[PDB]
Amino acid sequence: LQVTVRDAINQGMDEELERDEKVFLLGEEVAQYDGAYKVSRGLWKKYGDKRIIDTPISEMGFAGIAVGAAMAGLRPICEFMTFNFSMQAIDQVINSAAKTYYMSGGLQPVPIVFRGPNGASAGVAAQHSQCFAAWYGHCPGLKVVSPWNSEDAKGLIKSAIRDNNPVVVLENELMYGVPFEFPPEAQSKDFLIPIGKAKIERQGTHITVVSHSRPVGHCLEAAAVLSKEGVECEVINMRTIRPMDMETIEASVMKTNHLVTVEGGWPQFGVGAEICARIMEGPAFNFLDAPAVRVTGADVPMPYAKILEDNSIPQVKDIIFAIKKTLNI
Amino acid sequence: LQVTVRDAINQGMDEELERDEKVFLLGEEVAQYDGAYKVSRGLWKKYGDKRIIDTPISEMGFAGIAVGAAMAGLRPICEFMTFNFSMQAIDQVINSAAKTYYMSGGLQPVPIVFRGPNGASAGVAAQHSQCFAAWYGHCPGLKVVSPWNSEDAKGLIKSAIRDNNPVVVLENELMYGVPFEFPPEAQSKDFLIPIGKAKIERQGTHITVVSHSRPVGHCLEAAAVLSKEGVECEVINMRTIRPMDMETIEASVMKTNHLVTVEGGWPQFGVGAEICARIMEGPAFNFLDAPAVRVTGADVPMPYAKILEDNSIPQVKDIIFAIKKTLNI
Amino acid sequence: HMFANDATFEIKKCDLHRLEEGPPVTTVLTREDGLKYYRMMQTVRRMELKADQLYKQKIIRGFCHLCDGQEACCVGLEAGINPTDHLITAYRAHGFTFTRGLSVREILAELTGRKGGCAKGKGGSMHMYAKNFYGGNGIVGAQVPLGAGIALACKYNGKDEVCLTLYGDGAANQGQIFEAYNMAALWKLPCIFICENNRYGMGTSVERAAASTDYYKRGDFIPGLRVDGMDILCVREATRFAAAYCRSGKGPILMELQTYRYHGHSMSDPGVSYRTREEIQEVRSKSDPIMLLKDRMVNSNLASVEELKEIDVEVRKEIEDAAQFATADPEPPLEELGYHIYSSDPPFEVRGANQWIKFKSVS
Amino acid sequence: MFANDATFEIKKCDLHRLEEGPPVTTVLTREDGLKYYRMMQTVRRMELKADQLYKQKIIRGFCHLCDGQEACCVGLEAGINPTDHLITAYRAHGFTFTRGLSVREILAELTGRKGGCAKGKGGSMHMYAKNFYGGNGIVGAQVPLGAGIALACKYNGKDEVCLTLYGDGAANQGQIFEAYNMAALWKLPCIFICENNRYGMGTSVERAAASTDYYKRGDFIPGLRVDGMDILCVREATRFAAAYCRSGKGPILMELQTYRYHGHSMSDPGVSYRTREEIQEVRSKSDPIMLLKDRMVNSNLASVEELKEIDVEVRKEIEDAAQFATADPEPPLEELGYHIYSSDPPFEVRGANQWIKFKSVS
Ligand SMILES: Cc1ncc(C[n+]2csc(CCOP(=O)(O)OP(=O)(O)O)c2C)c(N)n1
Ligand SMILES: Cc1ncc(C[n+]2csc(CCOP(=O)(O)OP(=O)(O)O)c2C)c(N)n1
Ligand SMILES: [K+]
Ligand SMILES: [K+]
Ligand SMILES: [Mn+2]
Ligand SMILES: [Mn+2]
């Protein structure tokens, strides 16, 4: 069975809607249009106006409505068409949702999920290509996840929905149409992926390569090329941005002695920045036989032209290059 | 003489207003109320309605108006009452202002300044204590500065105004009433501090201690204590968050072999994370005799109760503790 | 001496927007209700004046926004709704926290940042919650879409409950409020949008901030009414009318309460640079909400001057006790700094000011 | 012998808080008519060509076409001066041309080549010109920007106005209401224009807006509703709204009732939420170009043969531009980091790893 990332997210939501009547989905084009990227296809016809709710283009407003509905006991899935547009609403996510349980001293939970595509796409230029992983990751009171493949996307959307706190689910528009082998355990309505646990996608002994979202697939392509030359990469799919699984990265580097981080976002104050900082502060630092280094998007607003875009996002050759530098090969 | 931080910012704005008729100030209570924290006192009386504009509580809208005016050739200073309230307006800062010169292929510059207090204050709790240095620092097309003392604030506000691009000036409410010796060079109306350049506030041989904003004064106190014990800290005042002066920090570390970063913001994907990752990727890494480590705010939304808040921001004793851990003493 | 069981009073007629008929212009007040509203408003007034004194003695710090002058609003709104209705407001919420069911002790102990406060000292002045009371919100405008979503949940659950969603005159120019108006109307949410107009948004008068100062009409396609927010009986009647309107399935409605705050915007605002002491004194002498009710009750023989004086004594003594409690109550223990980050999760550790400082976080 | 000019009836505008609106008669000269016809036809053929190039994969990402709305960009330009200001959202190829860029520069921008108006840095959504501020991809964001440009016109004192355009979907953005309030408060010379084409992406006006009288949403701001298929209606309304703002009376809202023939963008077939019959009927009975053509021919301002000669010339202009856009080289990789900051010395920008450095020059 192969299932595309978009269909696995769809299954996730569909299964959680059927399971809990308090669950509902709102955002622009989610209902009658079947989803701006077809992720919510068929949900409105199955569940109706009350459960799958098309909104006007009013981000701060409908995110605050979702947060309010959650405070009152419902379990909203608030879609942002992309996360670039969450900027209009980010006060609701941070000040109304993330901080509230703590401010209220544990009286008021906010079981809301914010989801939609994040980071770069193909040719959509600078207002539409931004990655928000490090921005949302920085904020106490939130959980932030970033699936790569179809199992990732189904298991994490289901965990997000079952969580009683705000969870930000940073999808990827280019992964939506990619089919993946879909294990029978992921086909279950009970399939959940724990928030806070990274997954080793490829075992190896020479270098630890950590990533999230789309670039995980490029790290795996990189490791396939490298193992023809006798180099074995251990590739780690973070899954969760906050709280990140540093323990899994540390134990990997204690075996491999080397670390490269790979992300699609801007480099400064980025996800790689935190991983490197933690590795240096932590028990694996003395195990490092070379500095940990970061592979990232280029440090520019995203250009439109194809060749400029190609060179503003990490390519497999950029990953191989940083790995070779790290291994002195 | 002594000049408080609030008065040095007032001086800078007054001088630049007098120098250039295209400069103007807008935001909530800037004009008739003499500023929410009195930073714009006397300016409306001197310059009038056209130049010093009280606004409704409409952050996205007035930030957008300011960005439009800058595009049309004016030179606005847009005040956020605190940077917490900039979240409402952050799309205008990042998508309309920051990315525009690049998107337009160098046709449309955006000479806007966003300024206001940032970070913790006293007993203002979780929606009002957030530091945005790493958030804004992350973004290409923006310049981001964070003054500590009176000299810093005057020279950097003048540089921000003279800059042709969007500049975020992250002030500090608790610093506003603090008096500093104000040398002749600073009292001059030509006083400018280059954006991008850190300043060494104290020379030292044992450890490099790097900070921004209020905690710079806590680092100097910590170094005054440690000096009586034979430990000489070199204290670096970043001044600029983006583009940070990594060369200055590198040259210090190659001398001292030790690094502690100090900031008031949240730790994960914070300012210290980026410095730590740069120091590991750069030429100074091999000069480290210990891991670089970070002193930050506690990783919580800011609590109200005095004893809780006291333990949520870095204290002199936490800076001293980190330093002694690093030196192994 | 026999007291009247009830009396009828004239209340100011509401100005109407898109409504053919508004609340009644007379209403019946029972002696029992009179006595109860009088004690409630006096409780809020005395609590607020105590907060002022505590704040000056540095026992309260950070933000403290007082609502004295506005007690006809929290108390009259409470008098027009059910305990099972919902309410959300901004930061000037001490009176609402009380009318919605918290004790003066818990409120003041939260202001003083002690373990006995309603959030054990985590929240302070701006963030207090109670059942069916959603704060207590410190970002201007942000509670308006929250209140609209609480109305959506009322509609979704089908219990004929409504949500009262309060915002000030300064907040009324927030974009998200307009976004909320449109969705509430589109979906017919049982949301009563309430503008508490005390004439100033911090230091900015309504005339300097709003091109139109008819707040009850800003909803445009949403009907609205403008209500005398100094008159507790006026507020109660408008409220009963607005809640009946939303429960009938007709969708959202706006109510503007014309009221007044005797204090500055907060403890840090003397309140004199943007208005005169005579304006405040004339509002007090002419329209104080407690004085208005007291005169109605005495003149109509619903209560004696001596009965009301005795309620005042009882209330002032309660606030003295409550303040003794809040001032003696220990701070929360340091070890609970990390508590209540996430709901329903296993315990975990939170980093403090450096990596060697670790706080336990439990749900 | 053609007529030098002719007098035409135009539809009366609905008014909100105005005691008189634009005139119900106008004079169109032969000269102006041939000009508007040529411009509208150039826009139409440019858009059709973009659709072609998108299907051939020479344009990628976003491509929102304005065909059907040509009376808007051309009518708006016909009612303002070159020294007035205009800002719109991302459906901007027509306004980019009417504000003075060439079809060559517009199409080379869409194809991502160095001959583009932004050197291939911006693509479809982000094109700028003198007094034309984009070309804005975040819905509603351009409205406060327009009010700010109007703030600058007032500050500078030269009697210039700013036309600030947003679609029906955008009309429910909070920042637009924040902008109406401050523009009224400060009497800004801002003309708020809602280009109502009936759909915000896939959501009809009836499903997004509780009230679908866009010209009245400004509330305390006066408004007019205008037939945006009729270039003469648009021009007259625009002349009236600009005179209004120039006299110092502050902002005004104009709703242009118009229609897009294509989907929301190249990725939207445009038929899950409306019928092909709906579109065909609009185009058959109220196409903006056929409406003008009928006016000119039937009033002897120009001949069927004249207009056909303009069509042939426009086709050659569009063909030449397309040939250039498809053959022009991509920008050179060395310029990836250029123009991050204005008026600064060169610096280095980090690429995909620390060993990749790009020079950035202003
Ligand atoms: C988005 C935002 N902007 C600014 C502030 C600072 N601030 C807090 S209250 C306030 C004035 C609000 O006045 P109004 O809505 O009239 O409420 P009132 O206190 O008079 O009831 C301001 C400007 C804030 N908390 N949030
Ligand atoms: C804030 C924001 N939300 C969502 C989007 C995605 N989006 C782009 S255009 C569009 C529809 C806007 O429709 P309308 O305003 O009616 O303009 P039209 O294209 O019909 O002229 C949407 C939802 C966006 N760009 N910005
Ligand atoms: K959940
Ligand atoms: K500047
Ligand atoms: Mn007010
Ligand atoms: Mn539209």
Report the alpha-carbon distance of residue D270 to residue D262 in Å, rounded: 6
Q: Collapse the DSSP code of B221 into the 3-class scheme (helix H, G, I; strand E, B; otherwise coil) and give the result.
A: helix
Cis omega (within 30 of 0) for bond into D148? no
Q: Kindly tell me the burial class for residue D82, based on how many C-beta atoms sit within 10 Å of its own C-beta (0-12, 13-18, 19 or more).
A: exposed
B179-181 vs B2-4, strand pairing mode: antiparallel
Gap between the Cα atoms of D340 and D337, Å rounded: 7
Q: What is the largest CA-CA distance in chain D?
A: 72
Taking alpha carbons only, the member of B27, B43, B38 closest to residue B4 is: B38
CA atoms within 13 A on the CB side of C234: 25
- Residues B97-121 as b/e (b if ≥16 CB within 10 A, e otherwise) read bbbbbbbbbbbbbbbbbbbbbbbbb
Instruction: D100-105: list long-range contacts, CB under 8 Å, 24+ apart.
Output: D100/D129, D100/D130, D100/D132, D101/D127, D101/D129, D102/D321, D103/D42, D103/D46, D103/D317, D103/D318, D103/D321, D104/D320, D104/D321, D104/D324, D104/D325
Is D200 near ligand 2, meaning CB less than 6 Å away? yes
Tell me the C-alpha to C-alpha distance, in Å, between residue D297 and each of B214, D35, D71, D287, D302.
Answer: 75, 14, 18, 16, 5
Beta strands (DSSP E) in chain B are 2-4, 23-27, 52-54, 75-79, 113-117, 143-145, 167-171, 179-181, 199-202, 207-211, 233-237, 240-242, 259-262, 293-295
Max Cα–Cα distance, chain A, nearest Å: 60
Q: Which residue has the tokens 């801002």?
A: D190
For residue D210, what is the nearest residue in chain C, using CA coordinates? C186
**Structure tokens of C234?**
């006026």
Q: Cβ–Cβ of A298/D139 closer than 8 Å? A: no
Q: How far apart are CA A200 and CA C221, in angstroms?
A: 56
Distance (Å, rounded) from C-alpha B22 to C-alpha B38?
Answer: 23
Distance (Å) from the alpha carbon of B186 to chain C's nearest alpha carbon: 31
How many whole angstroms from its chain centre is CA D56? 25
Query: Per the structure block, which two tokens stand in for C294?
Result: 């007291």
Q: How far apart are CA D360 and CA D362, in angstroms?
A: 7
Task: For residue C287, give the nearest of C249, C230, C224, C327 by alpha carbon.
Answer: C230
From the CB of D201, is ligand 2 less than 6 Å away? Answer: yes
Inter-helix orientation angle C232-247/C71-80, to 10°: 40
B167-171 β-sheet, strand order:
B52-54, B23-27, B75-79, B113-117, B167-171, B143-145, B240-242
Q: Which three-class secondary structure state does DSSP give residue B184?
A: helix
Give exposure, D222-242, as e/b (b: 16+ Cβ within 10 Å). Answer: bbbbbbbbbbbbbbbbbbbbb
For residues B305 and C332, is the Cβ–Cβ distance under 8 A?
A: yes
CA distance C192 to C166: 8
Asked if residues A33 and D269 have their Cβ atoms less than 8 Å apart, the reply is no
Neighbours of A28 (CB within 10 A): 27
Cα–Cα distances in angstroms (integers) from residue A291 to residues A249, B291, C93, C297, D53, in the given order:
15, 12, 53, 81, 47
The CA–CA distances, whole Å, from C164 to A66, C148, D265 equal 17, 9, 41
Nearest to A125 by CA among A266, A274, A309, A276: A309
Preceding peptide of B243 cis, ω within 30°: yes
Other Cβ atoms less than 10 A from the Cβ of C5: the count is: 10
Q: What's the rounded Cα separation, in Å, for the pair B211 and C325? A: 42
Task: Check if the beta carbon of residue D133 is closer than 8 Å to that of residue D85.
Answer: yes
Return the bridge partners of A75, or none: A23
- For the record, the structure tokens of B227 come out as 């000096």
D194 DSSP 8-state letter: E
The pick from A58, A81, A83, A87 for probing ligand 2's pocket by mutation, whose C-beta has the most ligand atoms within 8 angstroms, reads A81
3-state secondary structure B87-123: HHHHHHHHHHHHCHHHHCCCCCCCCCEEEEECCCCCC
**C-beta of residue C63 within 8 angstroms of C-beta of residue C51:** no
Phi, psi of B76 (to 5 degrees): -80, 150
Distance of CA B89 to the CA centre of its chain: 19
**Which region, left, alpha or beta, applies to residue C344 given φ > 0 means left and ψ of -120 to 50 means alpha?**
left
Residue type, A301: P
> B75 forms bridges with which residues in the sheet?
B23
Q: Which of residues 163-182 of C touch A (CB under 8 A)?
A: 175-176, 179-180, 182
Task: Report yes or no: D69 and D126 within 8 Å, Cβ to Cβ.
Answer: no
Return the residue of C nearest to B308 by Cα.
C337
Secondary structure (3-state) at B244: coil
- Solved using: X-ray
Is C331 strand, coil or helix? coil
Residue whose C-alpha is closest to residue A33's, from D269, D274, D203: D203
Specify the 3-state DSSP secondary structure of A211.
strand
Amino acid identity, residue A263?
E
Domains defined for chain C, CATH in brackets? 1-363 (3.40.50.970)
A25 and A52 Cβ atoms separated by less than 8 Å: yes
Element at A129 (helix H, strand E): none
Q: Enumerate residues 6+ apart whose C-beta is below 8 A from C191.
A: C147, C148, C150, C151, C162, C163, C165, C180, C184, C246, C252
Distance CA C199, CA C214 (A): 12
Query: What interhelical angle do C71-80 and C289-299 show, nearest 10?
Result: 60
Question: What residue owns the CA closest to ligand 2's atom 13?
Answer: D200
Identify the H or E element spanning C15: strand C15-17
- Using CA atoms, how far apart are residues C191 and C195, in angstroms rounded to an integer? 13
Q: How far apart are the first and last CA of chain C?
A: 57
Atom of ligand 2 nearest to the CA of D173: 1
- The answer to whether the annotation marks A181 as part of a ligand binding site is no
Q: How far apart are CA C144 and CA C141, in angstroms?
A: 6
Crossing angle of helices D231-246 and D288-298, in 10° steps, is 100
Residue C42 CA from chain centroid, whole number: 14
Tokens of D116: 């583009």
Closest CA to B135 of A269, D38, D213, C110: A269
Amino acid at C239: T
Q: Which residues are registered as beta bridge partners of C17?
A: C224
Which residues of A have a catalytic role annotated?
59, 128
Cα(D105)–Cα(A104) distance, integer angstroms = 57
Nearest C-alpha neighbor of D286 from the set D298, D278, D276: D278
| Amino acid at position B222, single letter | A
Number of residues that this document lists for chain A: 329
Residues 6+ apart with CB under 8 A from B284: B249, B250, B253, B254
- Residue A111 to residue A166: CA distance in whole angstroms: 6
* Chain B residues interacting with chain D (CB cutoff of 8 angstroms): 24, 50, 55-56, 58, 60-74, 91-92, 95-96, 101-111, 140-141, 143, 164-165, 243, 281
Given B15, B16, B28, B59, the catalytic residue = B59
Q: Which amino acid is at B175?
A: M
Tell me which H or E stretch contains B154. Answer: helix B150-162
Alpha-carbon dihedral of residues D222, D226, D232, D237, nearest 10 degrees? Answer: 0
Residues D202, A33: contact at Cβ < 8 Å? yes
What's the first-to-final CA gap in chain D, in angstroms? Answer: 56
Angle C105-C107-C108 from CA coordinates, rounded to 5°: 70
Joined tokens for residue D267: 């990725």
| C143-157 and C175-187 helices, crossing angle to 10° | 10
Is residue A254 within a helix (H) or strand (E), and if so which, with residue range? helix A246-256
| DSSP-derived secondary structure letter, D132 | B
Going by C-beta distance under 8 Å and a sequence separation of 6 or more, which residues neighbour residue A164?
Answer: A109, A111, C342, C343, C344, C345
DSSP for C171-224?
A: GGG-HHHHHHHHHHHHHT--EEEEEEE-SEETTEEHHHH-S---GGGTTTTS-E
Of the candidates C308, A277, D179, A227, the one whose C-alpha atom is nearest the C-alpha of residue B275 is: A277
| Total residues found in chain D within this entry | 362
Q: How far apart are alpha carbons A268 and B241 in whole angstroms?
A: 10
| Residue B34 structure tokens | 């003499």
Q: Please indicate if any CB of chain D lies within 8 Å of the CB of C334.
A: no
C7 CB neighbour count, 10 Å cutoff: 18
How many Å apart are CA B305 and CA B124, to the nearest integer? 10
CA distance D161 to D138: 23
Which residues touch D115 (CB under 8 Å, ≥6 apart)?
A: D104, D105, D108, D324, D325, D328
In whole angstroms, what is the distance from residue C362 CA to residue B285 CA?
38
Cα end-to-end distance, chain B, whole Å: 40
**How far apart are the CA of A134 and the centre of ligand 6, in A?**
34
CA atoms within 13 A on the CB side of D43: 29
- The resolution, in angstroms to one decimal, equals 2.0
What phi, psi does C88 have (nearest 5°)?
Answer: -140, 145
Radius of gyration of chain A (CA): 20
Residue A200: CB atoms within 10 Å: 14
Q: What is the largest CA-CA distance in chain C?
A: 73
Minimum-distance CB partner of B90 among A87, A270, A273: A87
Residue B176 — φ and ψ, nearest 5°? -55, -45
B138–A134 CB contact, under 8 Å: yes
Distance CA B320, CA B221 (A): 9
How many Cα atoms within 13 Å fall on the side-chain side of residue A248?
A: 20
State how far the Cα of C195 lies from the Cα of A317, in Å rounded to an integer.
59
How far CA B235 is from CA of B192, B209, B259, B264, B317, in Å, comes to 22, 5, 10, 16, 16
- Mark A45-62 as b/e (b = at least 16 C-beta within 10 Å): eebeeebbbbbbbbbbbb
HEC sequence for B261-305? EECCCCCCCCHHHHHHHHHHHCCCHHHCCCCCEEECCCCCCCCCC
- What lies within 8 Å, CB to CB, of D117 at 6+ separation is B105, D96, D101, D105, D106, D108, D109, D127, D128, D129
Backbone angles phi and psi of D257, in degrees to 5 = -85, 110
Residue B262 β-bridge partners: B211, B295
Alpha helices per DSSP H over D14-169: 30-55, 70-78, 93-98, 103-110, 142-156
- Distance (Å, whole) CA A200 – CA A214: 15
Beta bridge partners, C195, equal C167, C256
Q: Please, what is the Cα angle at D311 between D308 and D312, to 5 degrees?
A: 90
Structural domains in chain A plus CATH codes: 2-194 (3.40.50.970), 195-328 (3.40.50.920)
d(CA B271, CA A277): 10
Can you give the C-alpha Rg of chain B in angstroms?
Answer: 20
Q: Rounded CA gap, B39 and D170, in Å?
A: 37
